[PDB]
Amino acid sequence: TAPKSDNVYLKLLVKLYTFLARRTDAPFNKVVLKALFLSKINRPPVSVSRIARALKQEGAANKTVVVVGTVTDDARIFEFPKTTVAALRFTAGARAKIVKAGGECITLDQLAVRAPKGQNTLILRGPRNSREAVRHFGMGPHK
Amino acid sequence: MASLPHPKIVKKHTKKFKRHHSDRYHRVAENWRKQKGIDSVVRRRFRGNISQPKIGYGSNKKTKFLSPSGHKTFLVANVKDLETLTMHTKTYAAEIAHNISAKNRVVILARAKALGIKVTNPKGR
Amino acid sequence: MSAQKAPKWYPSEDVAALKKTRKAARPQKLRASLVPGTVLILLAGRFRGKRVVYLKHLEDNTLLISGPFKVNGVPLRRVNARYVIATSTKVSVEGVNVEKFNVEYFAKEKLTKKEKKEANLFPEQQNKEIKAERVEDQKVVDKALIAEIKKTPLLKQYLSASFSLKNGDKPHMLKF
Amino acid sequence: TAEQVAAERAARKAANKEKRAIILERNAAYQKEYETAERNIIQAKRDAKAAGSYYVEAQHKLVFVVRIKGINKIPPKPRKVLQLLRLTRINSGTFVKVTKATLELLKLIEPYVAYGYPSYSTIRQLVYKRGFGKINKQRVPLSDNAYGILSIDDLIHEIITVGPHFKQANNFLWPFKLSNPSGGWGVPRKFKHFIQGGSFGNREEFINKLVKSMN
Amino acid sequence: KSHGYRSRTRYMFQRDFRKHGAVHLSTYLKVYKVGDIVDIKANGSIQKGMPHKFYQGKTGVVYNVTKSSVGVIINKMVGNRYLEKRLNLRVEHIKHSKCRQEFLERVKANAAKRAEAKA
Amino acid sequence: MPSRFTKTRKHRGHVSAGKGRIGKHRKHPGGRGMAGGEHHHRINMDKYHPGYFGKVGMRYFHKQQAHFWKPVLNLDKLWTLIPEDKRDQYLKSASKETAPVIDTLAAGYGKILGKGRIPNVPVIVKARFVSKLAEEKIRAAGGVVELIA
RNA sequence: GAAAUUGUUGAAAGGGAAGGGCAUUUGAUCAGACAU
RNA sequence: GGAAUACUGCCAGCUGGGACUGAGGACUGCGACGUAAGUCAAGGAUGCUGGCAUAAUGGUUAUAUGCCGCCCGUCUUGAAACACGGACCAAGGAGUCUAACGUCUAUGCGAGUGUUUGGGUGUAAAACCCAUACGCGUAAUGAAAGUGAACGUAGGUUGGGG
RNA sequence: AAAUAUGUAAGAAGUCCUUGUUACUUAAUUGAACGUGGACAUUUGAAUGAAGAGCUUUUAGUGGGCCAUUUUUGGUAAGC
């Protein structure tokens, strides 16, 4: 599996990771492989606001958030955050505001020739739609 | 291009396997067709009657599509094409074409005649 | 469970205040003299469903039978040697047991006591009047599965290596 | 230099070496444990008729309980029973310890299976022969995902005197795929029985032979 | 022939033998426990502490104790899926149980430390 | 258009569905279109819906309410986070140092209500009130709202 | 200039009937393998 | 008294008769045998010695012959049916289209997103370019008048895991 | 008053110890419910099995059924 089909490049990434993993020991790989695979839903779309709450604090932030998908602008009028964390793509305001911060928009490949280990990397992925539920008639969720 | 002992190990049903009642009634035609009907003694498969045919009868990879006696094939049908096989031997080997003319043909032979390659459509016109 | 044993007071049934359950046994074999005292077992029959004290002190080839303690028809014929008689004593133990433990003409099942098997005949008196003295004349002979059985010592010794050794006994019979 | 190619070697070789003179400082030796007792019990019964009784002696092992029938049209409980006593094939067969959660089950199946009651040799062969692995045989080799202990002759040396870590051992062996009767058949009608002839029941003794012909 | 809420009950919701009336004022004392496992058992004297049929014989666990006589609850679940339904029974109808292996929890643990020092 | 049907044009004499055991016209769909009201095909799911599954509210003859909305959890973007700008100073106070005017010419830009946090010193132009938690929030930090008679 | 279908030549088979399926005998016919 | 056979076993004890089967550099790794170089077989299938044949061997095919096999499609618990359709060939014939929607899965953007009609232009139904709009979405709840969110957590912890 | 079938429970996140929270009712050092700190789990009857396990969406057909063995209802009976 892991496929997904499309953007060759997108595929190439799969390789480098599938290439690591099985290869490398560890986890942050295993995880980010079976992650590289997943379909457009159940694939969040974590926002800087997130990648921010997340970092600072939780008692650790010298780590590199690795949101395996897009990564939204959002508007938390101030704070944020100066950290290095990326992957799939990033929205304007994002790698932009993440550029004010400013850490490094990591491009999940680069962030592997670095992340070679996996240490100080926080895998942050999150949320549920968009749609409820079903099935309205109890009552319960709506529509 | 040394060939697995699978000459005649191909494969069973050396035998058309053709449409059911059609071995009879007039405008019943080609093949396999699985009398897909609610009763036909075939689709059921009581003793006697056609034999239907289904994966597992298939031919054993290590002597699969080639398959010939020589082995492989290709309608070499334009000199350069009739290369496309130059360095590659034996295994694989060419056939001319429904299409490929009379003149051009003697060549195609010729040319490959020497390039080292085998013509199935040996003859032709 | 369970384990080990003994007994020795009557034949049989004993030692309660806690009690027994099963079959202190000794494979009720036989059968002295030539071809008398025989497994005579009635073919002359309308089927397996029968039995009752066959034992002609009559003569021998002058032996006689029965058909129940009695109340579905209870007959009583004679016999002599090789007919409604031989030649199977059962398929024993295993059918031979079913039998004994279907002498619930006194309340058992998997309970206490065993043969406790009624009166005499070389049942006891046999391995119970005397105590097979040779059980001693047994010790004398060690003899062992020994000689060639066995002979591993003077043979398979060179194989007790293969014992667990897929090894030597892979070398020959047992492969893939 | 590549004397490292001769490093592991000295090891491996001698290494293997040890283990086996081990596999065999034992694998015989035990064929005395086994032998030893088999005489005792004899002698025991004899000390019996040294006087009286003795000597009722209980067992225990059990019993290759080998499926003497089918799939198509079988019970509904007694089905799942078979399934969990784990024997999903016609003429197939496992081994199961004589414990009442075993026994009980056995009986709930008795009708349609065949509680033999293993012999020694029958175990050897029924091991070694068709018997082995989730995939075949090489001693301490494969047989040391043990790890309690190793030796095909040790899988036996447990199984055929079960107890101790023992029968998580029997968790191992896809079991049987034994032969259909081979020589003899088992008299006339089989698929119903016990005594009365047939099959369907718990021989002993005469539990082996109907196995003896198979593997 | 009809399907009323005590239907068929003629012998289930039976009574007694000779104990044919009046709650054993013991069966009335005794204290619940927002956790302890109860075992339904209807008794015609009462009548909330009548447990509407199916939940007959069925043992569950006290989830409510409105101890003002109002017995507890428990639920259990039933057929197809097991959707666990809860029923507010009354103090006169339910009874203790055989969680009486905690006696052997004890036996265990204790005898097992006395096993520590023993070993 | 090699759909999923063509794969069917062969095996079975139908697909949808079971030979002759069903397959009719506007048919079995009891009625042609949302029919089986309180009768046939009913089972709820459902209902109300301020329209068609149980009627009751109040009528009129309507028109256009008011293009409103804009929360205060972000009265910063609002229209002035442009640059921005009149930024992290203090103004100071009222006068004309930081006036963002949440509105338009015909039907609105919001009713500054929201959650939020703010921090510094915005003047807020509007009429869409409001929130009074809003008020209490802007003035939380030198905040001051103005309306339009 | 297909087919249904008809003529002729040529072969083959037939004790109330049509024609399958597996193996082979016989006859007819064909490919490969050519080893230089 | 002294054996003897019978019968039931289990050998790691010897050897005959037949049958079918051969699917990978080394290697291997497990072993044995040999006191010793090395040998088997042990493993990776089976390798050896000798003979035959310019149509020999198989492929089709039509025949005979042993055995077996009833009409399909059809709705039916139930079809060979003493149920219906069909004498025989050709060529035609049937889940499409649209509006508007549910999932789910691609792709772009992404707190935003789509140009919409309509402008600009053009090698002219193309392609490429863009307004003040609009639609949907970022707020909910009420019949309605209204009123409307922290602490993108430190008046949310609590067990959950990766 | 059976047999068959039918509820539960099981080794164990569990006990054992220390105290802390207020709307609860006890007169409360009364408990209740919850939570901190502390001793021991791989656990010394349960057995036997696991091609993990859990979970979410969706959308076909189906709704005319028929056989047997036992247990039965009607009916002289029934290929009812």
From Swiss-Prot, chain A:
Keyword terms, alphabetized: Cytoplasm, Isopeptide bond, Methylation, Ribonucleoprotein, Ribosomal protein, Ubl conjugation
Q: What are the GO BP annotations of this UniProt entry? A: cytoplasmic translation
- Crosslink site(s) for Glycyl lysine isopeptide (Lys-Gly) (interchain with G-Cter in ubiquitin)? 100
Q: Which GO terms of the molecular function aspect are on file? A: RNA binding; structural constituent of ribosome
Tell me yes or no: is Ribonucleoprotein among this UniProt entry's keywords: yes
GO CC terms of this entry: cytosol; cytosolic large ribosomal subunit
Q: Name the predominant localization.
A: cytoplasm
**Modified residue annotations for N6,N6,N6-trimethyllysine:** 34
Q: Where in the cell is it found?
A: Cytoplasm
Give the family from UniProt. Belongs to the eukaryotic ribosomal protein eL18 family.
Q: What other remark does the UniProt record contain for this protein?
A: Present with 63700 molecules/cell in log phase SD medium.
Q: Tell me, in a sentence or two, what this protein's role is.
A: Component of the ribosome, a large ribonucleoprotein complex responsible for the synthesis of proteins in the cell. The small ribosomal subunit (SSU) binds messenger RNAs (mRNAs) and translates the encoded message by selecting cognate aminoacyl-transfer RNA (tRNA) molecules. The large subunit (LSU) contains the ribosomal catalytic site termed the peptidyl transferase center (PTC), which catalyzes the formation of peptide bonds, thereby polymerizing the amino acids delivered by tRNAs into a polypeptide chain.
**Quaternary structure?**
Component of the large ribosomal subunit (LSU). Mature yeast ribosomes consist of a small (40S) and a large (60S) subunit. The 40S small subunit contains 1 molecule of ribosomal RNA (18S rRNA) and 33 different proteins (encoded by 57 genes). The large 60S subunit contains 3 rRNA molecules (25S, 5.8S and 5S rRNA) and 46 different proteins (encoded by 81 genes). eL18 interacts with NAP1.
From Swiss-Prot, chain B:
GO MF annotation terms: structural constituent of ribosome
Q: Which PROSITE patterns match?
A: RIBOSOMAL_L32E (PS00580)
What Pfam families is this protein classified in?
Answer: Ribosomal_L32e
Keywords for the protein's UniProt record, in alphabetical order: Cytoplasm, Phosphoprotein, Ribonucleoprotein, Ribosomal protein
Taxonomy, superkingdom = Eukaryota
Question: Localized where?
Answer: Cytoplasm
SUPFAM superfamilies from the entry? Ribosomal protein L32e (SSF52042)
Q: Which GO terms describe its cellular component?
A: cytoplasm; cytosol; cytosolic large ribosomal subunit
Q: Which family does it belong to?
A: Belongs to the eukaryotic ribosomal protein eL32 family.
Tell me the function of this protein: Component of the ribosome, a large ribonucleoprotein complex responsible for the synthesis of proteins in the cell. The small ribosomal subunit (SSU) binds messenger RNAs (mRNAs) and translates the encoded message by selecting cognate aminoacyl-transfer RNA (tRNA) molecules. The large subunit (LSU) contains the ribosomal catalytic site termed the peptidyl transferase center (PTC), which catalyzes the formation of peptide bonds, thereby polymerizing the amino acids delivered by tRNAs into a polypeptide chain.
Q: What is the annotated quaternary arrangement, including any partners?
A: Component of the large ribosomal subunit (LSU). Mature yeast ribosomes consist of a small (40S) and a large (60S) subunit. The 40S small subunit contains 1 molecule of ribosomal RNA (18S rRNA) and 33 different proteins (encoded by 57 genes). The large 60S subunit contains 3 rRNA molecules (25S, 5.8S and 5S rRNA) and 46 different proteins (encoded by 81 genes).
| Protein name in the entry | Large ribosomal subunit protein eL32
Provide the gene name from the record: RPL32
UniProtKB/Swiss-Prot annotation, chain C:
- Covalent cross-link site, Glycyl lysine isopeptide (Lys-Gly) (interchain with G-Cter in ubiquitin): 128
Task: Tell me the residues on which N-acetylserine occurs.
Answer: 2
Alphabetically, which GO biological process terms does the record hold? cytoplasmic translation; ribosomal large subunit assembly
Instruction: Tell me the Pfam families matching this sequence.
Output: Ribosomal_L6e
Residues bearing Phosphoserine are 12
SUPFAM superfamilies for the chain: Translation proteins SH3-like domain
GO terms, molecular function:
RNA binding; structural constituent of ribosome
Among InterPro entries, the record links this protein to: 60S_ribosomal_eL6 (IPR000915), Rib_uL2_dom2 (IPR014722), Ribosomal_eL6_CS (IPR049633), Ribosomal_eL6_KOW (IPR041997), Translation_prot_SH3-like_sf (IPR008991)
- GO annotations of cellular component type: cytosol; cytosolic large ribosomal subunit
The identity of this protein, by name, is Large ribosomal subunit protein eL6A
What keyword terms does UniProt attach to this protein? Acetylation, Cytoplasm, Isopeptide bond, Phosphoprotein, Ribonucleoprotein, Ribosomal protein, Ubl conjugation
Give the quaternary structure.
Answer: Component of the large ribosomal subunit (LSU). Mature yeast ribosomes consist of a small (40S) and a large (60S) subunit. The 40S small subunit contains 1 molecule of ribosomal RNA (18S rRNA) and 33 different proteins (encoded by 57 genes). The large 60S subunit contains 3 rRNA molecules (25S, 5.8S and 5S rRNA) and 46 different proteins (encoded by 81 genes).
Cite any additional comment in the entry.
Answer: Present with 37100 molecules/cell in log phase SD medium.
From Swiss-Prot, chain E:
Q: Name one GO cellular component term.
A: cytosolic large ribosomal subunit
- Could you read off the lineage of the organism from its UniProt record? Eukaryota, Fungi, Dikarya, Ascomycota, Saccharomycotina
Crosslink Glycyl lysine isopeptide (Lys-Gly) (interchain with G-Cter in ubiquitin) sits at which residues? 30
Q: Give the function comment from the record.
A: Component of the ribosome, a large ribonucleoprotein complex responsible for the synthesis of proteins in the cell. The small ribosomal subunit (SSU) binds messenger RNAs (mRNAs) and translates the encoded message by selecting cognate aminoacyl-transfer RNA (tRNA) molecules. The large subunit (LSU) contains the ribosomal catalytic site termed the peptidyl transferase center (PTC), which catalyzes the formation of peptide bonds, thereby polymerizing the amino acids delivered by tRNAs into a polypeptide chain.
**Extra remark:** There are 2 genes for eL21 in yeast.
Q: What is this protein called?
A: Large ribosomal subunit protein eL21A
User: Main subcellular localization, coarse class?
Assistant: cytoplasm
Going by the UniProt record, its keywords in alphabetical order are: Cytoplasm, Isopeptide bond, Ribonucleoprotein, Ribosomal protein, Ubl conjugation
Is the keyword DNA damage in the record? Answer: no
Which superkingdom is the protein from? Answer: Eukaryota
Query: Where, subcellularly, is it found?
Result: Cytoplasm
